Design an enzyme around this catalytic site. Structure first.
Site, PDB file in Angstrom:
ATOM      1  N   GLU A  25      -3.099   9.477  -1.831  1.00  0.00           N
ATOM      2  CA  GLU A  25      -2.495   8.165  -2.001  1.00  0.00           C
ATOM      3  C   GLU A  25      -2.400   7.740  -3.461  1.00  0.00           C
ATOM      4  O   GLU A  25      -1.664   6.788  -3.775  1.00  0.00           O
ATOM      5  CB  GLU A  25      -3.289   7.073  -1.264  1.00  0.00           C
ATOM      6  CG  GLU A  25      -3.461   7.271   0.217  1.00  0.00           C
ATOM      7  CD  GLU A  25      -2.239   6.896   1.035  1.00  0.00           C
ATOM      8  OE1 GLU A  25      -1.272   6.344   0.443  1.00  0.00           O
ATOM      9  OE2 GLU A  25      -2.201   7.193   2.251  1.00  0.00           O
ATOM     10  N   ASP A  33       5.767   0.962  -2.475  1.00  0.00           N
ATOM     11  CA  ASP A  33       5.813   2.238  -1.777  1.00  0.00           C
ATOM     12  C   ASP A  33       7.261   2.615  -1.457  1.00  0.00           C
ATOM     13  O   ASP A  33       8.210   1.927  -1.831  1.00  0.00           O
ATOM     14  CB  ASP A  33       4.852   2.237  -0.585  1.00  0.00           C
ATOM     15  CG  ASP A  33       5.340   1.427   0.609  1.00  0.00           C
ATOM     16  OD1 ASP A  33       6.510   1.004   0.641  1.00  0.00           O
ATOM     17  OD2 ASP A  33       4.522   1.259   1.538  1.00  0.00           O
TER      18      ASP A  33
END
Ligand SMILES: [Cl-]
Ligand code: NA
Ligand code: NA
Ligand code: NA
Lengths: 75, 178
Positions: free
Chosen positions: B20, B29
């Site tokens: 991540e 994102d």
């Protein structure tokens, strides 16, 4: 890899600037080691994102950055 | 055959920092959602207004967030991660589709499922019907193939490749854990 300045900067700077740098560093490794994978790597950076690679590339000396190609594409 | 690892020397914190990344200021994102820390979703809406993002994040962190992009400390990133991990680990165990699989498989394969759930939510993992059915049956090759026959594998192929290898083998060698 661990690079003190790039670790701190990648964690904190403007997303667009950070992604440009990550992408440049990945593509330099691709060109050096497996240049035939350039377009495939670019496709996966586009579909999967760029920012997530900051930690392995810059903040972790236990990760060897040559392995970033496999990290992105899976082989 | 290929050995399994029932007690892999890797934590979920380590696995998820790797997959991540680690941000101390807001980013967005691939769906446009404001994110920080180790995959901490701030809002499940594609909000770009930093005054709004920072107000929400301030409540989550417990102190006033400043800057554009908004900033947190490493301690705060850790606290957010611990809570997100706890939420996912509880819910992956109880969900009626994913949970029985999690209970039946070794710790390496559990970490694979937890990794997926951190990425896509427990409900997202539950959509992998064929994969989960195969895992419950111990048909690792069928589970591996099913996991790779997915939009997840096409869109985040590197991560899906190393995660599906865990499902196949029952070890974390695909993450460098001997
Ligand atoms: Cl907005
Ligand atoms: Na650092
Ligand atoms: Na911790
Ligand atoms: Na757990």
């Amino acid at each position: 890899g661990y690079d003190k300045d790039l670790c701190e900067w990648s964690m904190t700077a403007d997303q667009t600037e950070v992604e440009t740098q990550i992408e440049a560093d990945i593509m330099n490794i691709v060109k050096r080691d497996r240049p035939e994978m350039k377009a495939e790597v670019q496709k996966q950076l586009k579909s999967g994102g760029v920012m997530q690679y900051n930690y392995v590339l810059y903040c972790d000396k236990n990760f060897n950055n040559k392995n970033i190609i496999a990290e992105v594409v899976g082989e | 055959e290929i050995p399994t690892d029932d007690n892999p020397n890797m934590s979920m914190a380590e696995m998820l920092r790797r997959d991540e990344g680690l941000r101390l200021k807001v980013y967005w994102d691939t769906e446009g959602y404001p994110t920080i820390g180790i995959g901490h979703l701030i809002m499940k809406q594609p909000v770009r207004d930093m005054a709004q993002i920072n107000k929400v994040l301030s409540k989550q962190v417990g102190r006033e967030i400043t800057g554009n992009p908004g900033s947190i400390t490493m301690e705060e990133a850790t606290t957010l991660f611990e809570r997100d991990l706890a939420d996912m680990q509880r819910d992956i165990k109880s969900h009626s589709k994913v949970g029985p699989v999690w209970q039946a498989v070794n710790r390496s394969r559990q970490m694979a499922l937890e990794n997926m759930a951190f990425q896509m939510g427990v409900g997202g993992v539950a959509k992998f019907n064929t994969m989960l059915t195969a895992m419950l049956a111990g048909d690792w090759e069928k589970a591996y193939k099913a996991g790779r026959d997915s939009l997840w594998y096409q869109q985040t192929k590197g991560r899906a490749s190393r995660v599906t290898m865990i499902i196949l083998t029952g070890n974390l060698e695909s993450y460098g854990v001997e």
